[PDB]
Design a protein around this ligand. Structure first.
Ligand SMILES: Nc1nc2c(ncn2CO[C@@H](CO)COP(=O)(O)O)c(=O)[nH]1
Ligand SMILES: Nc1nc2c(ncn2CO[C@@H](CO)COP(=O)(O)O)c(=O)[nH]1
Ligand SMILES: Nc1nc2c(ncn2CO[C@@H](CO)COP(=O)(O)O)c(=O)[nH]1
Ligand SMILES: Nc1nc2c(ncn2CO[C@@H](CO)COP(=O)(O)O)c(=O)[nH]1
Lengths: 203, 205, 204, 205, 201, 205
């Protein structure tokens, strides 16, 4: 029962991170999972293969790049990161919804190799708030992060849904809503309620 | 800017009626509205022009039929009933969402003249429940029931023609599913881009 | 299948009235309805036969008393009020839940004639609040209040006779407790076995 | 001065597990706690006596069987498992509600030595969904599945023996149904009469 | 035995009207009522003295104006409308919360004589939305929009500010302000007198 | 942006602990955080400086006491514990709301150096329930209970000193009351005027 793939993107300081987290805490694994990426970097203390990432050796990662195994990948200051098309494809095949957290670039790539995916973009409520959230806990470092954020936000129009994260809860509800709504699509419902519809039409 | 048009259909005994009602009680007029039909029949005690129907004289109704003013119409045992395409189009123009309650036939026609509209189909949770709900107050000839049940099955055959399917098992849950479809659509990019024009402007500098 | 009959009682000033009202505004007629009583009094402006009451003439009401047609009845300062047993029985038969608002006396009678009914009692959160609520618009003689307060204490004495007890401190919470009692009962095996006949069949 | 004991059972693939978990995350320990069984098997890495199980030696377990100390017990491929009538009686004695996750067999035993317990049965929404959930991660032999599916159908046969039936279609709704059953029971007269002793006193005076 | 008085103001097109309505539909009369105004106009079919309005004769209404009995009043195309200072004062005395819908001017006046008033200001989510909701001749609109901006200038004078983006959320914010106030110590100390007594004994 | 400081106090057995916990699980860090105290005691296994406490040496702690660096402090059987005026002040400066769990004494001190802070007091629903909750697992000498119950009554005497009073009858409702107090405060004009600077600007131009 082909599940849906959600590409979620947002400039640092909108909650993209937290929201997806919160969403999964109220969703059974047979309903919603998060996408798991492949990486060549050493797992940190506490991490675990299969959950956080799919830790593979540098050569394995390359063997894959060659055979077009990744839906998207990129080398980030040292190591490689990638979204195995077979990994996300397998789970979606079991009727599970998958959430993929990526930047606008990877978004475009995935959205290209997979037109059925839905994409959600989260935005901060105002520039002051974006600023405040970014400053988190040098005026020079901030100015850079703020700029990187504006860059990211430029691609907002490329997405399917737009969530403005003013108040966290409301935002988490908007997210939950997008999911639920999609699950109410005819293709999906026709599948889920096969038995019921059969009975109803048959005398 | 442009609001969405929702075509809602369901066999008698699924709540199509009640659900739309309940939905509007929690929605301001600048957000959501039920469509209002044009009729030639005399208003009953308590009704009011503009709310329940658009009461017009037999000739006015005909003048409209001619100028293709109706999105759909039909003569039911005596009088004429119609959904003015103007009356809708205009309100969609003010950014309001419009709910149109119609049978599968009219659904197809509208879905034809306005291929932007979204359509929702409501279904009963089981045959026993559909039956129970249909039997209503519980005082009808086994003969009348058998007919209504048949008319319902006919209606349900077209379920696959719709965009969304809601299974009305528990009323509340169903009213939430409905509310959800609406809210979700309002989160579409085209819509959000419009609503938050000012914000996005500021953000991009 | 067979719906449940809820006998709801409470001393004036706990919200028994409002709560049942609020409950029905969020419930379709094929799941929960309120019980409609018979009365001989003239309908007031706005009322309507079939919804608020079953307005019958003084003689019709008596013809019924004789044939043990009422589940309970009583003559209140002038007119007669009654709960047609044929009426509540026909409705429960369609799987609808019926709410009957009555005093402790009528409660006992119905609970007698229909041991399958569930009963809920609503109480005020404190004596001060009961008092406050009773004083209503704050325009009554200290004498009238003292009487109403007494009538209330009388009523509350029978609380232990009921199945569920709801303490109406905050309205919403109370309306949720009510809703909860209903929903829970609907989750009983007998009920669920019926509702999901088809599903269980397929599963086994 | 008296809590309720909830026997919860369900075929693998309905969420019985998850639901009880979720329920406890929103319930203080003086309100709701889980049951703790007695077992003779060696504790696994990470387990701890008093929380997961009450690890006792093979002879201790037998000494109890004799003195009718268990509400129910059974020997499962090697070791003994049991629900101490007293261990529970203690907690229940502090006004805490206890949730006992067991199979239909154990259910019958407990339901026998404590006919004051309430029982809840959780069911999957359809056979396709039960199947889908059972297939889990999706990496098993069509042979293993066919077995687990059969074990599930067996389990579901005893559904009618229970007090409440929850159909786990949508997780949240199910978790609410569960929460509801609890809350409702807590509204019973015997319970409320206790909790609001002081208030009722004042009111009748 | 003391309720709060809520002064609610907002520029036309924020929902001030609808929100207060919606609030009362989920609130019992012994908790939160709305202010009943005095009027000289004839009651319409279905209305009733005491509930919708306080129907008084033209002279009675004047007798009051003179003795500064009204908190505010105005003559609208024919009749007089007023909010009796004594009518509110009586209901707050029964522990009921009262909602007063008024313009910024009347707000200032009430905010000056009456002990215990909280004020809430509702605002539209954006200018486009305010415009959309307001929308007639381009001439009439331009006027209503201007009257709105005037009104909004006094937002800072209020205690709470609600931004009505999505109706529901707004109705929740409103409900929240109320509930929160009811959790104030003075209030709670009263409501739970009996409980606290028992606890400390 | 300037955040609010919440002083939360309650007699043992009202849930003060649990409630604050539950509150933070549904609140992002850029909105709500908990207060980190300074202490002179040795960190236990698993603890970490910056998260659980601010572990400082006995002399450092004294150097602070002198310069009125603490909002409140007290020496508990051996070591010193304190709430740094600057630790809180810093975060509050980033627009985050801070929750401080303390006894009535420390409450008074903080409320005195920061008269802007809001204070919330949680109470048990009745004496029986307070008792029941205090008795905990139910394994304490009638002597130990009588003491804890007395310490609780002492604590509750200062309830009137607080801003908000929450009666923890049912956990959920209580957690909602708490959440409500927070939300409401965030709707204060000073706060809203800040958060919606941009919007108000546009609206008035
Ligand atoms: N292109 C691409 N980049 C990724 C992917 N996953 C993570 N990244 C980005 O790389 C790092 C952040 O720069 C990942 O974060 P970290 O190093 O904290 O685990 C991925 O799947 N594809
Ligand atoms: N085909 C068609 N039937 C309608 C329309 N409106 C109403 N009907 C069906 O007619 C019945 C209403 O359910 C007649 O109206 P009433 O029940 O108010 O007398 C319409 O717009 N098109
Ligand atoms: N026993 C009994 N008393 C009723 C019934 N209905 C109303 N009463 C009692 O009288 C009143 C409530 O005390 C209702 O009359 P009213 O609401 O018209 O004032 C009823 O159905 N049975
Ligand atoms: N009769 C009985 N069986 C139990 C009890 N607890 C567990 N079982 C059965 O144990 C098997 C699971 O069905 C093995 O447990 P697990 O593999 O989850 O550790 C108990 O308390 N009583």
């Amino acid at each position: 029962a082909q599940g849906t793939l959600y590409i979620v993107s947002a400039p640092s300081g909108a909650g993209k991170s937290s929201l997806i987290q919160a969403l999964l805490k109220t969703q059974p694994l047979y309903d919603t999972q998060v996408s798991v990426s492949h990486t060549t970097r050493q797992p940190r203390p506490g991490e675990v293969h299969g959950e956080h990432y799919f830790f593979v050796n540098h050569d394995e990662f390359k063997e894959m790049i060659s055979r077009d195994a990744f839906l998207e990948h990129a080398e980030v200051f040292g190591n490689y990161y990638g979204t195995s098309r077979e990994a996300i494809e397998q789970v979606l095949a079991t009727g599970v919804d998958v959430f993929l957290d990526i930047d606008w670039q990877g978004a475009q790539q995935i959205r290209q190799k997979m037109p059925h995916a839905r994409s959600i973009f989260i935005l901060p409520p105002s520039k002051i708030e974006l600023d405040r959230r970014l400053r988190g806990r040098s005026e020079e470092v901030i100015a850079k992060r703020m700029a990187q954020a504006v860059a990211e936000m430029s691609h907002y129009a490329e997405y399917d849904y737009l969530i403005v994260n003013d108040d966290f809860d409301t935002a988490l509800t908007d997210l939950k809503t997008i999911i639920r709504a999609e699950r109410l699509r005819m293709s999906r419902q026709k599948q889920r309620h096969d038995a019921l519809i059969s009975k109803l039409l048959a005398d």
